[PDB]
Each structure stands twice: as C-alpha cells, then as structure tokens.
Coordinates of C-alpha atoms in Angstrom, one line a residue:
Chain A
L928 CA 78.4 80.5 140.2
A929 CA 80.3 83.4 141.8
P930 CA 83.5 83.2 144.0
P931 CA 83.0 83.0 147.7
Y932 CA 83.8 86.1 149.8
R933 CA 84.2 86.7 153.5
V934 CA 82.3 89.3 155.4
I935 CA 84.7 90.5 158.1
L936 CA 83.7 92.2 161.3
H937 CA 86.4 94.3 162.9
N938 CA 86.3 95.6 166.5
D939 CA 84.4 98.8 166.9
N940 CA 84.6 101.0 170.0
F941 CA 81.3 102.8 169.6
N942 CA 78.3 100.5 169.4
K943 CA 78.0 98.2 172.4
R944 CA 78.1 94.4 172.2
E945 CA 74.3 93.9 172.3
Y946 CA 73.6 96.2 169.3
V947 CA 76.3 94.4 167.4
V948 CA 74.3 91.2 167.9
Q949 CA 71.1 93.0 167.0
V950 CA 72.7 94.0 163.6
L951 CA 74.1 90.6 162.8
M952 CA 70.7 88.9 163.1
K953 CA 69.0 91.9 161.5
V954 CA 71.0 91.8 158.2
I955 CA 72.5 88.3 157.9
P956 CA 70.1 85.6 156.6
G957 CA 69.9 82.7 159.1
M958 CA 71.8 84.5 161.9
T959 CA 71.2 83.3 165.4
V960 CA 71.8 85.1 168.7
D961 CA 74.2 82.3 169.6
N962 CA 76.3 82.8 166.4
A963 CA 76.2 86.6 166.7
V964 CA 77.5 86.7 170.3
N965 CA 80.4 84.4 169.3
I966 CA 81.3 86.7 166.4
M967 CA 81.3 89.7 168.8
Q968 CA 83.4 87.8 171.2
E969 CA 85.9 86.7 168.5
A970 CA 86.1 90.0 166.8
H971 CA 86.6 91.7 170.1
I972 CA 89.3 89.1 171.1
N973 CA 91.2 89.0 167.8
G974 CA 90.2 92.3 166.3
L975 CA 88.3 90.6 163.5
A976 CA 85.9 87.7 163.0
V977 CA 84.3 86.0 160.0
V978 CA 80.6 86.9 159.9
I979 CA 79.5 84.8 156.9
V980 CA 80.9 83.4 153.7
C981 CA 78.7 83.9 150.6
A982 CA 78.7 84.6 146.9
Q983 CA 80.5 87.9 146.2
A984 CA 77.5 90.1 145.4
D985 CA 75.5 88.7 148.4
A986 CA 78.6 89.4 150.5
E987 CA 79.0 93.0 149.3
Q988 CA 75.3 93.6 150.1
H989 CA 75.4 92.3 153.6
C990 CA 78.6 94.2 154.2
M991 CA 76.6 97.3 153.1
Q992 CA 73.8 96.9 155.6
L993 CA 76.3 96.2 158.3
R994 CA 78.2 99.5 157.6
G995 CA 74.9 101.3 157.3
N996 CA 73.9 100.2 160.7
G997 CA 77.1 101.5 162.1
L998 CA 79.4 98.5 162.2
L999 CA 82.9 98.3 160.7
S1000 CA 82.9 95.4 158.3
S1001 CA 85.1 94.4 155.4
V1002 CA 84.9 92.1 152.4
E1003 CA 87.7 89.8 151.2
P1004 CA 87.9 86.8 148.9
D1005 CA 87.6 83.5 150.6
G1006 CA 91.2 82.4 149.9
Chain B
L746 CA 107.2 94.7 166.3
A747 CA 106.2 92.5 163.5
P748 CA 103.3 92.7 161.0
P749 CA 100.2 90.7 161.9
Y750 CA 99.2 87.5 160.2
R751 CA 96.1 85.4 160.7
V752 CA 96.1 81.7 161.6
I753 CA 92.9 80.2 160.2
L754 CA 91.0 77.1 161.3
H755 CA 88.9 75.5 158.6
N756 CA 85.9 73.2 159.1
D757 CA 86.5 69.5 158.3
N758 CA 84.1 66.5 158.4
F759 CA 86.5 64.2 160.3
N760 CA 87.4 65.7 163.7
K761 CA 85.1 65.7 166.6
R762 CA 84.1 68.9 168.3
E763 CA 85.9 68.0 171.5
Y764 CA 89.1 67.0 169.7
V765 CA 89.2 70.3 167.8
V766 CA 89.0 72.1 171.2
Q767 CA 91.7 69.9 172.8
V768 CA 94.1 70.5 169.9
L769 CA 93.6 74.3 170.0
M770 CA 94.4 74.3 173.7
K771 CA 97.5 72.1 173.2
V772 CA 99.3 74.1 170.5
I773 CA 98.1 77.8 170.7
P774 CA 99.8 79.8 173.4
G775 CA 97.4 81.5 175.8
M776 CA 94.4 79.6 174.7
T777 CA 91.5 79.2 177.1
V778 CA 88.9 76.5 176.8
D779 CA 86.3 79.3 176.4
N780 CA 88.2 80.8 173.4
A781 CA 88.7 77.3 172.0
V782 CA 85.1 76.3 172.0
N783 CA 84.3 79.7 170.3
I784 CA 86.8 79.1 167.5
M785 CA 85.6 75.5 167.0
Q786 CA 81.9 76.8 167.0
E787 CA 82.7 79.5 164.5
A788 CA 84.6 77.3 162.0
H789 CA 81.8 74.8 162.2
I790 CA 79.1 77.3 161.5
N791 CA 80.9 79.6 159.1
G792 CA 83.4 77.2 157.5
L793 CA 86.5 79.0 159.0
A794 CA 87.6 80.9 162.0
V795 CA 90.5 83.1 163.1
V796 CA 92.5 81.2 165.7
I797 CA 95.1 83.9 166.6
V798 CA 96.8 87.0 165.1
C799 CA 100.6 86.9 165.4
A800 CA 103.8 87.4 163.6
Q801 CA 104.3 85.5 160.3
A802 CA 106.8 83.0 161.6
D803 CA 104.6 82.2 164.6
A804 CA 101.5 82.0 162.4
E805 CA 103.3 79.4 160.2
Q806 CA 104.3 77.4 163.3
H807 CA 100.9 77.2 164.7
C808 CA 99.3 76.4 161.4
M809 CA 101.8 73.5 161.1
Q810 CA 101.1 72.3 164.7
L811 CA 97.4 72.3 163.9
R812 CA 97.8 70.4 160.6
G813 CA 100.1 67.8 162.3
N814 CA 97.3 67.2 164.8
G815 CA 94.8 66.6 162.0
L816 CA 93.1 70.0 161.5
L817 CA 92.8 72.1 158.3
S818 CA 94.7 75.4 158.8
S819 CA 95.9 78.3 156.6
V820 CA 98.0 81.4 157.2
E821 CA 97.2 84.8 155.7
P822 CA 98.2 88.5 156.1
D823 CA 95.9 90.5 158.5
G824 CA 94.6 92.9 155.9

C-alpha cells in the first residue's frame, strides 16, 4: 500500500476556532470534537498541527476539502 | 533570528500517559501542563505531535532530552 502522509493545519486568522472544529469533523473520517479542539489549540499555539496521517491519496483528498472549506492545510510525507 | 525546526513527539506503546506529560514538562522550556496533555493526547490519537518549534540546535537538544527520558522524538525543518 501507499506511503503515509501528514495533513497539516496551519494557523489561519480568518475563520474562528469553532468553525475550524466544524470543518475537521466535517471532512476527516472519525474526527471527534475533542480531537478537533486539540488540533485548533495546537495549530494556534505552534503555528501548525497534525490533523491526520493517512495513505497519500486519502490525505490529498482530505487536504482538498479542508482548503475548500476555507482552512489552510498542507500535505507532507510522514517522515 | 534562526530558521524554525520542529520537535516531534511520536506515539509509543510503553510510556504511560501521565509519564509522557511529566517528561514534556521537565525538558521543554515554557511548557504548561495544559500544553503537555494536549501534545500527549495528539500523539496518542494521531501517531505524532509537534512539541515545539525552535532553532535547529535547540530542536536537537530537546529531541535528545526526550529520547533520554524514554520517548520517541524526531527533528525536522518547519516547511
């Protein structure tokens, strides 16, 4: 199977913390409100936070819906 | 000032949640118990978590301090 990739969430200064959480659970399979608030907290604290690690194609897709809902997210290889 | 590097905390199946939190508080400058539990939570759920973003030399130091206290840690460039 395919290499693992990291979906990165970078701080954004436009959408507010609650919507961020809304998006995370909206697009990410298995995403809880508990996990999403941590991600927001950690991305806001460090500038970036790991959203999920998944096969590359699945990662690219979830990164797409994130960007399309207005959040700034990057993909990088899990290494 | 210096280019940013990431100190990464990886999940492992040996350390206890509370121990992970104590180590983070011990070695990482400025670390709150609130931030530490978040980092531990995020590595546990996602497989890895960003501990701190700092200069390369400092990132290496903290990664080594983590490893010496029994945790799985890597350093990488913030990009």
